[PDB]
Protein backbone atom coordinates (compact mmCIF):
# COMPACT_ATOMS: atom_id res chain seq x y z
CA UNK A 1 0.00 0.00 0.00
CA UNK A 2 3.04 2.28 -0.16
CA UNK A 3 2.17 3.50 -3.65
CA UNK A 4 -1.58 3.84 -3.09
CA UNK A 5 -1.34 5.75 0.19
CA UNK A 6 1.12 8.23 -1.32
CA UNK A 7 -1.28 9.03 -4.17
CA UNK A 8 -4.23 9.67 -1.84
CA UNK A 9 -2.12 11.92 0.38
CA UNK A 10 -0.99 14.13 -2.51
CA UNK A 11 -4.50 14.75 -3.83
CA UNK A 12 -5.75 15.44 -0.29
CA UNK A 13 -3.02 18.02 0.30
CA UNK A 14 -3.71 19.53 -3.13
CA UNK A 15 -7.39 20.13 -2.33
CA UNK A 16 -6.54 21.46 1.13
CA UNK A 17 -4.10 23.98 -0.37
CA UNK A 18 -6.67 25.43 -2.77
CA UNK A 19 -9.22 25.93 0.02
CA UNK A 20 -6.72 27.91 2.10
CA UNK A 21 -5.78 30.16 -0.83
CA UNK A 22 -9.35 31.20 -1.64
CA UNK A 23 -10.11 31.97 2.01
CA UNK A 24 -6.99 34.14 2.36
CA UNK A 25 -8.19 36.12 -0.66
CA UNK A 26 -11.52 36.76 1.09
CA UNK A 27 -9.85 38.10 4.24
CA UNK A 28 -7.66 40.52 2.27
CA UNK A 29 -10.72 41.84 0.42
CA UNK A 30 -12.76 42.04 3.62
CA UNK A 31 -10.12 43.79 5.76
CA UNK A 32 -9.32 46.25 2.97
CA UNK A 33 -13.00 47.09 2.41
CA UNK A 34 -13.90 47.72 6.06
CA UNK A 35 -10.94 50.08 6.47
CA UNK A 36 -12.02 52.58 3.81
CA UNK A 37 -15.69 52.36 4.80
CA UNK A 38 -14.62 53.50 8.27
CA UNK A 39 -12.60 56.33 6.60
CA UNK A 40 -10.66 56.76 9.87
CA UNK A 41 -7.12 56.17 8.58
CA UNK A 42 -5.09 54.00 6.21
CA UNK A 43 -2.39 51.85 7.86
CA UNK A 44 0.80 51.89 5.81
CA UNK A 45 1.09 48.09 5.87
CA UNK A 46 -2.43 47.81 4.45
CA UNK A 47 -1.31 50.08 1.60
CA UNK A 48 1.65 47.80 0.88
CA UNK A 49 -0.56 44.70 0.72
CA UNK A 50 -3.01 46.35 -1.68
CA UNK A 51 -0.37 47.71 -4.07
CA UNK A 52 -16.27 21.78 0.15
CA UNK A 53 -16.85 23.58 3.45
CA UNK A 54 -17.00 20.27 5.34
CA UNK A 55 -13.49 19.05 6.14
CA UNK A 56 -12.08 16.67 3.56
CA UNK A 57 -10.85 14.04 6.03
CA UNK A 58 -14.30 13.65 7.63
CA UNK A 59 -16.21 11.98 4.82
CA UNK A 60 -17.53 9.15 6.92
CA UNK A 61 -18.65 10.69 10.22
CA UNK A 62 -22.39 10.16 9.80
CA UNK A 63 -22.48 6.90 7.86
CA UNK A 64 -20.49 4.75 10.30
CA UNK A 65 -19.57 4.87 13.97
CA UNK A 66 -16.00 5.95 14.83
CA UNK A 67 -13.48 3.41 16.11
CA UNK A 68 -11.17 4.80 18.79
CA UNK A 69 -7.94 3.30 20.15
CA UNK A 70 -6.29 4.55 23.35
CA UNK A 71 -2.65 4.02 24.30
CA UNK A 72 0.01 5.60 26.50
CA UNK A 73 3.70 6.38 26.53
CA UNK A 74 6.20 3.61 27.17
CA UNK A 75 6.43 2.19 30.71
CA UNK A 76 3.23 3.77 32.06
CA UNK A 77 2.75 4.64 35.71
CA UNK A 78 0.08 3.05 37.87
CA UNK A 79 -2.25 6.06 37.77
CA UNK A 80 -1.75 6.60 34.03
CA UNK A 81 -3.10 3.08 33.48
CA UNK A 82 -6.23 4.04 35.43
CA UNK A 83 -6.76 7.20 33.38
CA UNK A 84 -6.56 5.31 30.08
CA UNK A 85 -9.10 2.85 31.49
CA UNK A 86 -11.55 5.67 32.23
CA UNK A 87 -11.19 7.29 28.80
CA UNK A 88 -12.19 3.96 27.26
CA UNK A 89 -15.54 4.10 29.05
CA UNK A 90 -16.11 7.74 28.06
CA UNK A 91 -15.89 7.05 24.32
CA UNK A 92 -18.46 4.49 23.12
CA UNK A 93 -16.83 1.55 21.38
CA UNK A 94 -13.32 2.62 22.34
CA UNK A 95 -10.53 0.12 22.99
CA UNK A 96 -7.42 0.38 25.15
CA UNK A 97 -4.20 -1.39 24.17
CA UNK A 98 -1.05 -2.11 26.15
CA UNK A 99 2.00 -0.19 24.93
CA UNK A 100 4.99 -2.48 25.19
CA UNK A 101 8.15 -1.91 23.17
CA UNK A 102 6.02 -0.76 20.25
CA UNK A 103 7.46 1.76 17.81
CA UNK A 104 5.10 4.67 17.14
CA UNK A 105 5.09 4.08 13.38
CA UNK A 106 4.31 0.40 13.91
CA UNK A 107 1.20 1.32 15.91
CA UNK A 108 -0.15 3.57 13.15
CA UNK A 109 0.20 0.97 10.39
CA UNK A 110 -1.63 -1.64 12.47
CA UNK A 111 -4.44 0.80 13.25
CA UNK A 112 -4.83 1.73 9.58
CA UNK A 113 -4.91 -1.93 8.54
CA UNK A 114 -7.72 -2.79 10.97
CA UNK A 115 -9.88 0.24 10.20
CA UNK A 116 -9.32 2.18 13.42
CA UNK A 117 -10.66 5.69 12.92
CA UNK A 118 -8.86 7.69 15.63
CA UNK A 119 -5.85 7.17 17.89
CA UNK A 120 -5.38 8.70 21.35
CA UNK A 121 -2.05 8.94 23.21
CA UNK A 122 -1.75 10.24 26.78
CA UNK A 123 1.36 11.35 28.70
CA UNK A 124 1.88 11.83 32.44
CA UNK A 125 4.05 13.69 34.94
CA UNK A 126 4.59 12.22 38.42
CA UNK A 127 1.45 10.12 38.11
CA UNK A 128 -0.87 12.83 36.80
CA UNK A 129 -1.88 13.03 33.11
CA UNK A 130 -0.39 16.10 31.44
CA UNK A 131 -0.72 15.68 27.65
CA UNK A 132 -3.15 14.27 25.11
CA UNK A 133 -2.67 13.67 21.37
CA UNK A 134 -5.64 13.10 19.05
CA UNK A 135 -4.93 11.79 15.55
CA UNK A 136 -7.34 11.12 12.70
CA UNK A 137 -5.67 8.11 11.11
CA UNK A 138 -6.48 8.29 7.36
CA UNK A 139 -4.00 11.17 6.91
CA UNK A 140 -6.23 13.35 9.09
CA UNK A 141 -5.25 16.20 11.38
CA UNK A 142 -3.35 15.71 14.63
CA UNK A 143 -4.12 17.96 17.61
CA UNK A 144 -1.85 18.37 20.64
CA UNK A 145 -3.39 19.17 24.03
CA UNK A 146 -2.16 19.75 27.58
CA UNK A 147 -4.20 18.77 30.63
CA UNK A 148 -4.54 21.07 33.63
CA UNK A 149 -6.92 19.88 36.38
CA UNK A 150 -7.54 16.13 36.21
CA UNK A 151 -10.00 14.54 38.64
CA UNK A 152 -10.52 10.80 38.19
CA UNK A 153 -13.43 8.58 39.17
CA UNK A 154 -10.95 6.32 40.96
CA UNK A 155 -10.14 9.15 43.39
CA UNK A 156 -13.82 9.57 44.29
CA UNK A 157 -15.19 6.67 46.38
CA UNK A 158 -18.41 4.68 45.79
CA UNK A 159 -19.45 6.24 42.47
CA UNK A 160 -20.60 2.95 40.92
CA UNK A 161 -20.88 2.09 37.24
CA UNK A 162 -21.74 4.48 34.41
CA UNK A 163 -24.58 4.45 31.91
CA UNK A 164 -22.25 3.76 28.94
CA UNK A 165 -25.00 4.77 26.48
CA UNK A 166 -24.46 7.00 23.47
CA UNK A 167 -24.33 10.55 24.86
CA UNK A 168 -25.59 13.94 23.72
CA UNK A 169 -22.92 16.50 22.86
CA UNK A 170 -22.78 20.14 23.98
CA UNK A 171 -20.34 22.57 22.36
CA UNK A 172 -20.15 26.03 23.91
CA UNK A 173 -17.88 29.04 23.52
CA UNK A 174 -16.33 28.12 20.15
CA UNK A 175 -16.96 31.07 17.83
CA UNK A 176 -13.83 31.75 15.76
CA UNK A 177 -12.86 29.81 12.65
CA UNK A 178 -10.17 27.93 14.59
CA UNK A 179 -12.67 27.17 17.35
CA UNK A 180 -15.02 25.70 14.76
CA UNK A 181 -12.09 23.60 13.51
CA UNK A 182 -11.24 22.39 17.03
CA UNK A 183 -14.81 21.54 18.04
CA UNK A 184 -15.16 19.42 14.90
CA UNK A 185 -12.24 17.18 15.91
CA UNK A 186 -13.69 16.59 19.37
CA UNK A 187 -17.25 16.00 18.14
CA UNK A 188 -16.43 13.40 15.48
CA UNK A 189 -14.93 11.13 18.15
CA UNK A 190 -18.53 10.28 19.13
CA UNK A 191 -21.25 8.26 17.36
CA UNK A 192 -24.73 9.45 16.49
CA UNK A 193 -26.80 9.14 19.70
CA UNK A 194 -30.45 8.37 20.34
CA UNK A 195 -33.08 11.05 20.94
CA UNK A 196 -34.04 9.69 24.37
CA UNK A 197 -30.46 9.46 25.67
CA UNK A 198 -29.90 10.86 29.16
CA UNK A 199 -26.09 11.04 28.95
CA UNK A 200 -24.53 14.45 28.29
CA UNK A 201 -20.91 15.33 27.48
CA UNK A 202 -19.98 19.01 27.42
CA UNK A 203 -17.08 20.95 25.92
CA UNK A 204 -17.00 24.55 27.17
CA UNK A 205 -14.42 27.08 26.00
CA UNK A 206 -13.26 29.88 28.32
CA UNK A 207 -10.18 31.96 27.42
CA UNK A 208 -8.70 29.17 25.25
CA UNK A 209 -9.22 26.59 28.03
CA UNK A 210 -11.68 23.80 27.23
CA UNK A 211 -13.53 22.18 30.12
CA UNK A 212 -14.70 18.58 29.77
CA UNK A 213 -17.77 17.64 31.81
CA UNK A 214 -19.80 14.42 31.85
CA UNK A 215 -23.32 14.28 33.26
CA UNK A 216 -26.55 12.31 33.41
CA UNK A 217 -29.84 14.15 33.94
CA UNK A 218 -33.22 13.00 35.23
CA UNK A 219 -36.53 14.85 34.78
CA UNK A 220 -38.37 14.59 38.08
CA UNK A 221 -40.95 17.08 36.80
CA UNK A 222 -41.47 19.69 34.11
CA UNK A 223 -38.98 22.58 33.86
CA UNK A 224 -36.87 21.16 36.73
CA UNK A 225 -33.92 18.92 35.86
CA UNK A 226 -31.36 17.45 38.27
CA UNK A 227 -27.73 16.98 37.21
CA UNK A 228 -25.41 14.39 38.75
CA UNK A 229 -21.77 14.71 37.74
CA UNK A 230 -20.08 11.46 36.69
CA UNK A 231 -16.87 10.60 34.89
CA UNK A 232 -13.48 12.30 34.79
CA UNK A 233 -13.04 16.06 34.94
CA UNK A 234 -10.20 17.93 33.24
CA UNK A 235 -9.21 20.99 31.20
CA UNK A 236 -7.74 21.05 27.69
CA UNK A 237 -5.44 23.63 26.09
CA UNK A 238 -4.57 23.30 22.41
CA UNK A 239 -1.11 24.33 21.23
CA UNK A 240 -0.61 22.70 17.81
CA UNK A 241 -2.49 21.20 14.86
CA UNK A 242 -0.61 19.23 12.19
CA UNK A 243 -1.95 18.03 8.85
CA UNK A 244 -0.40 14.55 8.91
CA UNK A 245 -0.65 11.60 11.28
CA UNK A 246 1.44 11.30 14.45
CA UNK A 247 3.88 9.11 12.50
CA UNK A 248 4.75 12.23 10.46
CA UNK A 249 6.20 14.95 12.71
CA UNK A 250 9.20 15.47 10.43
CA UNK A 251 7.23 15.95 7.19
CA UNK A 252 3.73 17.25 7.98
CA UNK A 253 2.93 20.96 7.85
CA UNK A 254 1.53 22.93 10.78
CA UNK A 255 -1.99 24.23 10.24
CA UNK A 256 -1.95 26.24 13.48
CA UNK A 257 0.52 26.65 16.33
CA UNK A 258 0.55 28.75 19.49
CA UNK A 259 3.21 31.47 19.65
CA UNK A 260 3.81 32.49 23.29
CA UNK A 261 6.81 34.82 22.79
CA UNK A 262 4.91 37.28 20.58
CA UNK A 263 4.89 40.83 21.95
CA UNK A 264 1.08 40.73 22.26
CA UNK A 265 0.72 37.01 23.03
CA UNK A 266 -0.40 37.56 26.63
CA UNK A 267 -3.63 39.46 25.88
CA UNK A 268 -4.79 37.50 22.82
CA UNK A 269 -7.18 34.54 22.49
CA UNK A 270 -7.74 32.35 19.43
CA UNK A 271 -10.74 30.07 20.10
CA UNK A 272 -13.26 32.92 20.43
CA UNK A 273 -14.01 36.23 18.72
CA UNK B 1 -15.52 17.18 -8.90
CA UNK B 2 -18.46 18.36 -11.00
CA UNK B 3 -19.17 18.41 -14.75
CA UNK B 4 -16.95 21.50 -15.17
CA UNK B 5 -13.80 19.37 -15.25
CA UNK B 6 -15.53 17.01 -17.69
CA UNK B 7 -14.97 19.53 -20.51
CA UNK B 8 -11.17 19.33 -20.18
CA UNK B 9 -10.77 15.73 -21.38
CA UNK B 10 -8.76 15.60 -24.60
CA UNK B 11 -6.36 13.32 -26.45
CA UNK B 12 -3.64 14.36 -23.99
CA UNK B 13 -5.55 12.83 -21.08
CA UNK B 14 -5.84 9.50 -22.90
CA UNK B 15 -2.17 9.57 -23.92
CA UNK B 16 -1.11 10.15 -20.31
CA UNK B 17 -2.77 6.89 -19.24
CA UNK B 18 -0.84 4.69 -21.70
CA UNK B 19 1.40 2.00 -20.24
CA UNK B 20 4.77 3.35 -21.53
CA UNK B 21 4.20 6.88 -20.23
CA UNK B 22 3.19 5.56 -16.81
CA UNK B 23 6.59 3.87 -16.66
CA UNK B 24 8.06 7.25 -17.57
CA UNK B 25 6.10 8.85 -14.73
CA UNK B 26 7.15 6.11 -12.30
CA UNK B 27 10.81 6.72 -13.31
CA UNK B 28 11.10 3.10 -14.48
CA UNK B 29 12.25 4.64 -17.79
CA UNK B 30 13.77 7.99 -18.74
CA UNK B 31 12.90 8.13 -22.45
CA UNK B 32 9.71 7.30 -24.30
CA UNK B 33 11.41 5.08 -26.88
CA UNK B 34 13.12 3.21 -24.05
CA UNK B 35 9.80 2.99 -22.19
CA UNK B 36 8.06 1.60 -25.27
CA UNK B 37 10.91 -0.85 -25.91
CA UNK B 38 10.71 -2.37 -22.41
CA UNK B 39 7.11 -3.39 -23.06
CA UNK B 40 7.28 -5.79 -25.99
CA UNK B 41 10.14 -7.96 -24.71
CA UNK B 42 7.92 -8.54 -21.68
CA UNK B 43 9.90 -6.92 -18.85
CA UNK B 44 6.77 -5.17 -17.51
CA UNK B 45 3.82 -6.83 -15.79
CA UNK B 46 0.58 -5.44 -14.40
CA UNK B 47 -0.02 -7.66 -11.40
CA UNK B 48 0.28 -11.35 -12.27
CA UNK B 49 -0.21 -10.71 -15.98
CA UNK B 50 2.46 -9.50 -18.41
CA UNK B 51 1.38 -6.86 -20.93
CA UNK B 52 3.10 -6.47 -24.31
CA UNK B 53 0.72 -3.97 -25.93
CA UNK B 54 2.00 -0.37 -25.72
CA UNK B 55 -1.56 0.81 -26.42
CA UNK B 56 -2.95 -0.10 -23.00
CA UNK B 57 -4.65 2.27 -20.56
CA UNK B 58 -3.88 1.40 -16.94
CA UNK B 59 -6.41 2.23 -14.21
CA UNK B 60 -5.47 4.14 -11.06
CA UNK B 61 -5.92 0.95 -9.03
CA UNK B 62 -3.83 -1.11 -11.46
CA UNK B 63 -1.16 1.61 -11.59
CA UNK B 64 -0.20 0.66 -8.02
CA UNK B 65 0.61 -2.89 -9.17
CA UNK B 66 2.89 -2.36 -12.18
CA UNK B 67 6.45 -3.61 -11.74
CA UNK B 68 9.29 -5.50 -13.36
CA UNK B 69 8.58 -9.11 -14.20
CA UNK B 70 10.64 -11.62 -12.25
CA UNK B 71 13.69 -13.21 -13.88
CA UNK B 72 14.28 -10.10 -16.01
CA UNK B 73 17.71 -8.67 -16.76
CA UNK B 74 16.61 -5.15 -15.78
CA UNK B 75 15.50 -6.33 -12.34
CA UNK B 76 18.95 -7.87 -11.82
CA UNK B 77 20.56 -4.49 -12.47
CA UNK B 78 18.23 -2.74 -10.02
CA UNK B 79 18.98 -5.30 -7.30
CA UNK B 80 22.71 -5.16 -8.07
CA UNK B 81 22.82 -1.37 -7.71
CA UNK B 82 20.95 -1.57 -4.39
CA UNK B 83 23.23 -4.42 -3.20
CA UNK B 84 20.12 -6.54 -2.59
CA UNK B 85 20.52 -9.46 -5.00
CA UNK B 86 19.36 -12.74 -3.44
CA UNK B 87 19.77 -15.80 -5.66
CA UNK B 88 17.50 -17.97 -3.50
CA UNK B 89 14.54 -15.94 -4.79
CA UNK B 90 15.87 -16.28 -8.37
CA UNK C 1 12.62 18.65 5.31
CA UNK C 2 12.49 18.89 1.51
CA UNK C 3 15.07 16.11 1.19
CA UNK C 4 13.15 13.90 3.61
CA UNK C 5 9.81 14.21 1.82
CA UNK C 6 11.43 13.07 -1.43
CA UNK C 7 12.38 9.83 0.34
CA UNK C 8 8.73 9.05 1.15
CA UNK C 9 7.66 8.76 -2.49
CA UNK C 10 10.88 7.03 -3.57
CA UNK C 11 10.18 4.15 -5.94
CA UNK C 12 12.20 0.99 -5.24
CA UNK C 13 11.64 -0.18 -8.82
CA UNK C 14 13.17 2.97 -10.36
CA UNK C 15 15.89 2.24 -12.91
CA UNK C 16 18.60 4.29 -14.62
CA UNK C 17 21.22 3.32 -17.18
CA UNK C 18 23.97 4.75 -14.95
CA UNK C 19 23.10 2.01 -12.45
CA UNK C 20 24.40 -0.64 -14.85
CA UNK C 21 27.65 1.36 -15.26
CA UNK C 22 42.36 -0.27 -20.97
CA UNK C 23 43.88 -3.23 -22.84
CA UNK C 24 47.33 -4.80 -22.37
CA UNK C 25 48.59 -3.16 -25.57
CA UNK C 26 47.49 0.29 -24.38
CA UNK C 27 48.70 -0.39 -20.83
CA UNK C 28 52.14 -1.44 -22.09
CA UNK C 29 52.30 1.68 -24.29
CA UNK C 30 51.61 3.95 -21.30
CA UNK C 31 54.41 2.31 -19.31
CA UNK C 32 56.83 2.74 -22.23
CA UNK C 33 55.93 6.43 -22.48
CA UNK C 34 56.39 6.78 -18.72
CA UNK C 35 59.92 5.37 -18.73
Amino acid sequence: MLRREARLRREYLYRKAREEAQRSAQERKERLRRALEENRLIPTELRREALSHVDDEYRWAGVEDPKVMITTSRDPSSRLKMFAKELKLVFPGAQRMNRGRHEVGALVRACKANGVTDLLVVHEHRGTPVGLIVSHLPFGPTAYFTLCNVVMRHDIPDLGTMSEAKPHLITHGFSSRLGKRVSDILRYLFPVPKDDSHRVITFANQDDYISFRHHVYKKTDHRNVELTEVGPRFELKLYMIRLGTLEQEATADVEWRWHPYTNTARKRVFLST
Amino acid sequence: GSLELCDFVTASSFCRRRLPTVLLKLRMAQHLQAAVAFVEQGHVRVGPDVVTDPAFLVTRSMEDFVTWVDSSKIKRHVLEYNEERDDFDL
Amino acid sequence: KALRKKALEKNPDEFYYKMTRVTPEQLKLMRTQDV
Binding site: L13, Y14 | S12, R16 | A2, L3
Partner: peptide, 30 residues
Protein backbone atom coordinates in the same frame (compact mmCIF):
# COMPACT_ATOMS: atom_id res chain seq x y z
CA UNK D 1 -2.70 17.54 -29.42
CA UNK D 2 -0.35 16.18 -26.77
CA UNK D 3 2.80 18.09 -25.79
CA UNK D 4 6.31 17.08 -26.74
CA UNK D 5 7.47 13.77 -25.21
CA UNK D 6 10.41 15.52 -23.55
CA UNK D 7 8.03 17.81 -21.69
CA UNK D 8 7.23 16.84 -18.10
CA UNK D 9 3.55 17.67 -18.67
CA UNK D 10 3.45 14.72 -21.09
CA UNK D 11 3.29 12.38 -18.08
CA UNK D 12 2.26 14.72 -15.23
CA UNK D 13 -1.17 16.08 -14.32
CA UNK D 14 -1.93 19.23 -12.33
CA UNK D 15 -1.67 17.39 -9.00
CA UNK D 16 1.89 16.23 -9.72
CA UNK D 17 2.86 19.66 -11.08
CA UNK D 18 1.72 21.38 -7.88
CA UNK D 19 3.83 19.10 -5.69
CA UNK D 20 6.87 19.07 -7.98
CA UNK D 21 6.99 22.87 -8.23
CA UNK D 22 7.09 23.14 -4.43
CA UNK D 23 9.81 20.48 -4.18
CA UNK D 24 11.88 22.09 -6.95
CA UNK D 25 11.78 25.52 -5.28
CA UNK D 26 12.85 24.15 -1.89
CA UNK D 27 15.76 22.16 -3.32
CA UNK D 28 16.91 24.99 -5.59
CA UNK D 29 16.96 27.33 -2.59
CA UNK D 30 19.45 25.02 -0.88
Amino acid sequence: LPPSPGDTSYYQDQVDDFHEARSRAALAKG
